[PDB]
Design a binder for this molecule. Structure first.
Ligand SMILES: Cc1cc2nc3c(=O)[nH]c(=O)nc-3n(C[C@H](O)[C@H](O)[C@H](O)COP(=O)(O)O)c2cc1C
Lengths: 807, 353, 141, 94
């Protein structure tokens, strides 16, 4: 229909009023912006001038009527926090929004047996009122008709679920920074959407008031600096750091020497003019890296200054430290897709769903008055449309996979325009894919850019156990990767200093024999290390402290490790080497941002120990290789041996589906159980690997030899036929033979496993132990299962006294 | 604005929007009514006379509405009344069935996987040929055991002994397709030297050009809406008004003897119950006129293949063409005045008795 | 096989007036035999064959009496497969006459033949592996 | 329970599990079940010098989850660090 858009009259005898009317309001009542002009007949060349006093106030009053449903009041503090009204998400609203922005993800479409999610872009619908109320205050003065939306961003808070229909959301908004620039005034706003009292996501919106501003007393800025790292090498560095007045450590006697420090600071500044600051405040915590790679706060950065030309703290950290960057670029971008998209023919539906009733998108006269190329489409519509594209393609239409999305509006877009967006996988960040996109219009002009953070597909990391340890394992990564080098070098240094041998040497060269020489002071210290270690055991409920290396006494000048074809096969050297290979590989993966934060993990035999060090970081590298070497040596002395390091026991892999197509596991578990019972020796099943296809038995190498023969006789009626020998094993691992050690082993681990180095959040629901094939949980049911299978007294002390601990 | 689209092909919406059921249901009804009109007009007959020449009528899913509406016609004045009834029913079927289960984008990985294996674009209806109903039901059960209740699939169209169609969510049908291609031999496999009993069964599958799971549990919630709407729109079919047998698509029974509302039964058959085409077609007739869309790829050719060797002739009234095999007629055969207008298909039991 | 039947149809089409006797036999016949079922290829190709009036349809491979051929003469055989009746034009009997008085089979050979019991059609395929009904399958040169 | 008491209990549990693991059988069957069905997993990454557990998981999938994987449309990916570097690091060759 036809309605009055503009009226022109004489509001006075000398004042012309042009009342520009917007009809598409929230209430349906039209809103008028009165533009006032002076008519001066004396100046015949230009009799009409514009009345500037309060023009910005009139424009803001119009936009307040259009956008904010609260009483008009422009006198509130920008430094304060704006609180938004509670929002109830409904299926109708999600439907309307998704249809307006052209998002056809099934997660948002109502379906039976599935609650419907709301799209990430719905956060603007939720928090637009609070976000846009930030640019109104009279201290942040500007022409709203020249307001430009520079960029918008969404950021899911880690561990927060996506919005869903039925949620009640609360919005809070604060201005992060408002600074005057020569081309105008930038206002950066941060909104926080909270569900049930917990925050869900953060919205960052950057606005631009084009013009010339010099009211620097109203301006301020806040920047989260990149984290800076410093390796304190020499006493010179300590002295210089202690000279800086801002560098404050709580423990004045802390030893910075050979320590890695990280500084994470924030700078709050006010301005006196374009070039100079009127106040500078840099602050934050100082943290120190630990042997377990966990950083702990040791002090606070604290710099406060008045008039200044810069921040000295950031300059010092830039020049002396290095900046840690979370994002890690792939060596080559991986193209995902190039897609076609189109702008709607009317901007009204998006305005109505989003509440963004800016006239420039719908009203021709307002857009002409603003000198725009037309009724430009909302930038936020374009952002939502491109995010729908990215979600469909980059995230394979799995909505929850998209955790972050930021866009920059580099140019305006008119309705009925063909857009072409190109999507690329460029890097990783904290286990999430980094997607860049760039949208061009028909003229081939970039109109929109941004990035996205897509979570990886659900992942499980699985760590291999003892097996065929090959010469040179992990050495290519050792040559190329810096994290691998760190792991291997720390371990090799510890081994050289403590036991006079290099594990790297054993991996690289695999010597048949290795002699340790106890000459000199260092030799004597190494000999003492060898002498100390023991193999405690429980006999009939009594400790029996043996000594490993009975040949080594205070008159020994050397000791020789022996083998047949190479010591890399020996247990004490194979276990630490495999642990290091796996830890190094995982550290390299972590250093490239490839480890999902929710990745569950497990390890097969030895792998379990390595997996905990890699994902849980329960012990430092030096402790890890130390305990594995102690355990490996214990195994050598658990079984009687001979020269070249051999044993009477052994292990074989069994394929029950090879003796007969109808030989169930419970049948094999029956035969082996009886064979040992019907023969009085030790033999059992140690590894259930593949259903009815892979079982490993451990025991006497003679007894195992009968087991294969018997099954070979079973397979004759209704290597080996069904029993291949697992090379590299020389002890009955996972057998009741080793039950005595479990007591000393527990004491040795309870010693070495530091109480404070175990983070439940790193284990709960992620770690699946081999003892109980159930994800780790600190619950009575878990401890009950542990006690059930393998009775342990401390466990049931936890059980029987649970009420005491739970409270 | 169908008139605008017909006038200017350049400004006709794209194929996918046309194919959406709220469009294609009434449009296909209109196509069928228009073909019925041309036949009558050319034969210098009124709709009532042409219907009186028919021993009976029936339809394949959506076509049942057109069948009953045609059975309603009496003269050129009441023909528009019947047409309004039919297209009203179809329009509301399309609208409510699209509202109940609207189509949503499929992950592009699945699209790529389906294309790379000589398979079509997934849709809510899968056509499986050269397999018994028991085998297809076996595969359907296997697939459905792993799926929740709301995503289960089912057989919708029992077109023939070896011709079946499964309706359900495109994702579930894709999973079923994965199972099927894990159990299908390559077409270019030679088994002439292998014993027949041990031969690996060969078959084919493809996705139909449709955009809704007809005859499926998913559209069940729309039945009450459709029934409640038709009573308001003043659409109803009376058994007295129908004057030729119209066969129900579930049991092939005559709709005129139905005790309840014929419109309710028609909508139930379209959206919920499966089509047992062989059961519906058990009538005895010499000639069958196919007005439905598809031409040589329509329901007439399927019915001809089902009924081969029983002395039944199929004429596809919708298209003009020449059949080299000459086993079924085209539009011309309906109007030919020579003997060429009367062609009898072979009845083996009688010819080679 | 099916392709052979198509070739026969093409021959008959090239000479529409010349009579062609399509002697169809399954893999269950005596002597040299194939791997084909006796019924499925006919159920597939009967219509195509009857498109051509000059083809005469003979059925063989497994017949020895009027009782077991009459269903094929009347076409009632194909109804068990849920098909319309498909009558045939004639039958051939190879094995059935090998113990006829005028054949040159040796008397002990005739007794050996008669002593074979044979097997029903659903089990004829069990000659590729072991004797069944006194008959087995072996490979030629 | 309090975070400190929770950490104490977790430490006790972890020490007990590690202590008893080497003297009790390794239930890789239940673990493969857990992380292939109870969590599902589109990528299983084996950290080791050879594809042992990768082969184990591939066999388990082939023998216990063909129909379930097909029905639920999972594009599972079994990768071993030793042989599958490109897919682990997203470095496909040009
Ligand atoms: C002993 C014997 C010899 C045969 N020799 C030939 C032959 O030389 N050429 C040929 O085309 N078919 C030959 N056949 C196949 C027959 O012509 C006929 O197809 C077959 O015997 C019919 O199957 P039936 O034995 O079950 O009755 C022979 C069959 C038998 C039993």
């Amino acid at each position: 229909e036809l309605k009055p858009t503009v009226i022109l009259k004489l509001l006075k005898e000398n004042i012309i009023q042009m009342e520009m009317i917007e009809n598409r309001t929230m209430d349906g009542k039209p809103v008028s912006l009165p533009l006032l002009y002076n008519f001066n007949p004396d100046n015949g060349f230009a009799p009409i001038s514009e009345v500037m006093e309060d023009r910005n106030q009139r424009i803001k009053e119009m936009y307040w009527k259009l956008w904010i449903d609260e009483p008009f009041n422009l006198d509130f503090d920008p430094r304060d926090v704006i609180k938004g009204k509670d929002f109830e998400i409904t299926a109708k609203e999600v439907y309307d929004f998704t249809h307006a922005v052209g998002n056809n993800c099934e997660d948002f479409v109502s379906r039976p047996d599935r609650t419907m999610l709301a799209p990430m872009d719905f956060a603007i619908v939720v928090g637009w009122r609070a976000i846009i109320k930030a640019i109104f205050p009279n201290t942040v003065d500007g022409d709203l008709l020249k307001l430009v939306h520079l960029s918008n961003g969404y950021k899911m808070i880690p561990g927060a679920k996506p919005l869903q229909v039925g949620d009640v959301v609360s919005t809070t908004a604060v201005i992060e920074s408002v600074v005057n620039q020569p081309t105008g005034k930038i206002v950066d706003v941060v909104g926080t959407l909270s569900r049930n009292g917990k925050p869900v996501m953060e919205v960052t919106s950057s606005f631009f008031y084009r013009g010339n501003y010099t009211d620097f007393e109203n301006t301020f800025q806040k920047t989260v600096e990149p984290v800076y790292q410093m390796h304190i090498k020499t006493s010179k560095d300590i002295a210089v750091l202690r000279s800086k007045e801002w560098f404050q450590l709580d423990d004045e006697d802390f030893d910075l020497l050979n320590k890695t420090l990280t500084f994470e600071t924030e700078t709050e500044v006010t301005f006196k003019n374009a070039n100079i600051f009127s106040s500078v405040k840099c602050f934050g915590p100082i943290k120190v890296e630990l042997p377990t790679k966990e950083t702990v706060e040791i002090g606070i950065v604290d710099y406060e200054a008045g008039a200044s030309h810069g921040n000295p703290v950031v300059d010092f950290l830039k020049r002396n430290g290095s900046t840690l960057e979370q994002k890690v670029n792939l060596e080559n971008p991986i193209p995902i897709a190039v897609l076609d998209s189109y702008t709607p023919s009317t901007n009204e539906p998006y305005a109505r769903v989003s509440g963004d009733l800016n006239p420039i998108h719908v009203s021709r006269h307002f857009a002409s008055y603003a000198n725009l190329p037309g009724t430009i489409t909302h930038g936020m519509f374009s952002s939502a449309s491109v995010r729908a594209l990215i979600e469909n393609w980059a995230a394979d239409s799995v909505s929850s996979r998209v955790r972050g999305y930021t866009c920059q509006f580099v140019d305006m877009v008119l309705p009925n325009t063909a857009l072409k967006t190109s999507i690329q996988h460029v890097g990783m960040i904290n286990g999430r894919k980094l997607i860049k996109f760039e949208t061009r219009n028909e003229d081939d002009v970039v109109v929109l850019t941004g990035e996205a953070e897509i979570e990886q597909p659900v992942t499980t990391f699985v760590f291999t156990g003892q097996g065929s340890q090959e010469q040179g394992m992990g050495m290519d990564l050792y040559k190329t990767s810096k994290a691998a080098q760190d792991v291997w070098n720390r371990a090799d240094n510890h081994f050289k200093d403590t036991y006079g041998f290099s594990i790297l040497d054993i991996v690289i060269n695999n010597p048949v024999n290795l002699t340790i020489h106890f000459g000199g002071e260092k030799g004597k210290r190494i000999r003492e290390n060898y002498s100390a270690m023991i193999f405690e055991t429980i006999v009939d409920g009594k400790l029996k402290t043996e000594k490993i290396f009975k040949e080594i006494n205070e008159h020994s000048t050397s000791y020789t490790f022996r083998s047949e074809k190479g010591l890399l096969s020996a247990t004490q050297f194979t276990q630490p080497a495999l642990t290091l290979m796996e830890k190094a590989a995982f550290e390299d993966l972590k250093s490239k941002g490839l480890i999902p934060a929710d990745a569950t993990f497990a390890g097969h035999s030895l792998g379990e120990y390595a997996a905990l060090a890699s994902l849980a970081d329960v012990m430092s590298i030096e402790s890890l290789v130390e305990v594995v070497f102690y355990r490996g040596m214990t195994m050598q002395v658990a079984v009687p041996r001979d020269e070249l390091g051999r044993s009477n026991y052994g292990m074989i892999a069994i394929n029950p589906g090879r003796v007969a197509a109808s030989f169930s596991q419970e049948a094999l578990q029956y035969v082996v159980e009886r064979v040992g019972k019907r023969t009085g020796w030790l033999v059992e099943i140690v590894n259930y690997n593949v259903e009815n296809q892979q079982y490993v038995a451990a025991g006497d190498l003679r007894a195992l030899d009968t087991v294969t023969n018997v099954l070979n006789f079973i397979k004759l009626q209704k290597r080996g036929f069904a029993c291949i020998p697992l090379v590299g094993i020389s002890v009955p691992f996972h057998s009741t033979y080793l039950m005595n050690g479990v007591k000393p082993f527990k004491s040795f681990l309870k010693k070495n496993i530091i109480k404070e180095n175990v983070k439940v959040a790193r284990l709960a629901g992620k770690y699946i132990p081999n003892l109980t094939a159930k994800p780790f949980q600190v619950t009575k049911e878990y401890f009950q299962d542990v006690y059930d299978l393998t009775g342990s007294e401390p466990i049931k002390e936890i059980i029987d006294n649970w009420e005491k601990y739970e409270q | 604005n169908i008139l605008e689209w017909l006038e200017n092909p350049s400004n006709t919406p794209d194929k996918d929007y046309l194919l959406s059921i709220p469009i294609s249901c009434p449009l296909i009804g209109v196509i069928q009514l228009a073909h019925y009109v041309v036949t009558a007009k050319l034969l210098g007959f009124t709709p009532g006379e042409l219907r009186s020449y028919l021993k009976g009528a029936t339809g394949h899913s959506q076509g049942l509405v057109t069948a009953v509406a045609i059975a309603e016609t009496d003269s050129w004045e009441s023909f528009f009344v019947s047409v309004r009834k039919a297209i009203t029913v179809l329009f509301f079927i399309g609208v409510r069935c699209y509202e109940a289960y609207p189509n949503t984008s499929l992950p592009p990985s699945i699209l790529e996987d389906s294309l790379e294996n000589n398979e079509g674009v997934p849709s809510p209806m899968l056509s499986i040929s050269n397999l018994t109903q028991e085998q297809v039901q076996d595969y359907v059960n296997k697939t459905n055991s792993h799926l929740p209740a709301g995503k289960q699939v089912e057989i919708s169209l029992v077109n023939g002994a070896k011709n079946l169609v499964v309706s359900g969510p495109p994702q579930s049908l894709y999973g079923l397709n994965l199972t099927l291609r894990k159990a299908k031999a390559p077409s270019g496999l030679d088994q002439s030297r292998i014993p027949f009993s041990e031969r690996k069964l060969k078959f084919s599958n493809r996705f139909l050009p449709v955009a809704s799971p007809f005859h499926s549990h998913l559209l069940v919630p729309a039945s009450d809406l459709i029934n409640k709407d038709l009573v308001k729109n003043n659409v109803s079919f009376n058994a007295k008004d129908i004057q030729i047998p119209v066969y129900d698509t579930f049991d092939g029974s005559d709709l005129r003897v139905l005790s309840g509302s014929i419109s309710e039964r028609i909508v139930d058959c379209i959206i919920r119950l499966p089509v047992k085409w062989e059961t519906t077609t058990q009538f005895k007739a010499t000639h069958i006129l196919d007005f439905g869309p598809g031409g040589a790829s329509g329901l007439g050719v399927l019915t001809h293949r089902n009924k081969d060797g029983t002395g039944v002739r199929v004429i596809v009234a919708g298209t003009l063409d020449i059949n080299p095999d000459d086993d079924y007629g085209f539009k011309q055969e309906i109007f030919d005045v020579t003997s060429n207008g009367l062609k009898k298909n072979p009845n083996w039991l009688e010819e080679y008795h | 096989s099916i392709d052979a039947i198509s070739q026969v149809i093409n021959i008959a089409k090239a000479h529409p007036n010349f009579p062609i006797a399509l002697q169809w036999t399954g893999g269950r016949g005596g002597g040299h035999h194939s791997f084909e079922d006796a019924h499925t290829p006919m159920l597939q190709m009967y219509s195509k064959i009857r498109r051509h009036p000059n083809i005469m349809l003979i059925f063989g491979s497994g017949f020895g009496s009027a009782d077991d051929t009459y269903p094929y003469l009347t076409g009632e055989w194909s109804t068990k497969f849920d098909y319309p009746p498909m009558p045939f034009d004639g039958f051939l009997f190879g094995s059935r006459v090998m113990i006829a008085k005028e054949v040159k089979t040796s008397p002990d050979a005739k007794k050996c033949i008669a002593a074979c019991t044979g097997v029903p059609d659903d089990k004829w395929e069990q000659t590729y592996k072991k004797p069944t009904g006194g008959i087995v399958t072996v490979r030629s040169e | 329970m309090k975070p400190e008491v929770e950490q104490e209990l977790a430490h006790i549990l972890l020490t007990e599990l590690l202590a008893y693991q080497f003297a009790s059988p390794v239930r890789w069957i239940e673990t493969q079940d857990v992380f292939l069905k109870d969590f599902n997993t589109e990528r299983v990454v084996e950290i080791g010098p050879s594809p042992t557990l990768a082969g184990m998981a591939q066999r388990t999938l082939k023998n216990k989850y063909e129909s379930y994987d097909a029905a639920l449309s999972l594009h599972r990916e079994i990768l071993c660090y030793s042989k599958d570097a490109k897919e682990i690091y997203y470095t496909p060759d040009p």
